[PDB]
Design a protein around this ligand. Structure first.
Ligand SMILES: *[C@@H]1O[C@H](CO)[C@@H](O[C@@H]2O[C@H](CO)[C@@H](O)[C@H](O)[C@H]2NC(C)=O)[C@H](O)[C@H]1NC(C)=O
Ligand SMILES: *[C@@H]1O[C@H](CO)[C@@H](O[C@@H]2O[C@H](CO)[C@@H](O)[C@H](O)[C@H]2NC(C)=O)[C@H](O)[C@H]1NC(C)=O
Ligand SMILES: *[C@@H]1O[C@H](CO)[C@@H](O)[C@H](O)[C@H]1NC(C)=O
Lengths: 49, 56, 7
């Protein structure tokens, strides 16, 4: 079933007892933490044989 | 609980896993702050049942 | 409901 991705994340938050408005009020900040964490994986894997 | 949906002319809320359109009200919704912050929000009425009863 | 008893 297609769903917009920021709405799927509201369901994931609701699964861990965080009320879904806490995502939307912080959406750009949460997106930037995830985007940054992905970058650290590449550097970790590139450096750490 | 559940999701907002539209049939084009109207807006409803439904549970997630079986389509059951219900009118949107202060019963089946909760507020959090002013409109400005939320990406993708839309205008509509949200109905509030108490008003006509106070007007009885 | 407390303020609505103005009705
Ligand atoms: C969206 O839902 C509303 C409410 O069910 C539909 O409005 C009704 O339409 C029927 C005919 O299909 C009329 O007999 C009713 O009098 C209408 N009720 C209201 C409250 O307007 C509307 O037609 C639906 N739109 C679409 C495109 O499905
Ligand atoms: C939802 O309704 C509000 C008004 O309650 C709309 O805000 C006005 O929109 C017009 C046209 O874009 C602007 O000229 C005004 O300056 C806006 N006023 C305010 C207080 O911002 C709003 O645009 C509507 N939302 C949508 C997506 O249509
Ligand atoms: C959806 O994305 C398009 C660009 O792909 C944009 O023009 C549109 O404003 C977006 N709408 C919403 C509701 O975010």
């Amino acid at each position: 079933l297609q769903i917009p991705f920021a709405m799927q994340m509201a369901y994931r938050f609701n699964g861990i007892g965080v009320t879904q408005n806490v995502l939307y009020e912080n959406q750009k900040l949460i997106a930037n933490q995830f985007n940054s964490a992905i970058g650290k994986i590449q550097d970790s894997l590139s450096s750490t044989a | 609980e559940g999701v907002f949906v539209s049939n084009g002319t109207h807006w409803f809320v439904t549970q997630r896993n079986f389509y059951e359109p219900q009118i949107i009200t202060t019963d089946n919704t909760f507020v959090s702050g002013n409109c400005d912050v939320v990406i993708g929000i839309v205008n509509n009425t949200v109905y509030d049942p108490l008003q006509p009863e106070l007007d009885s």
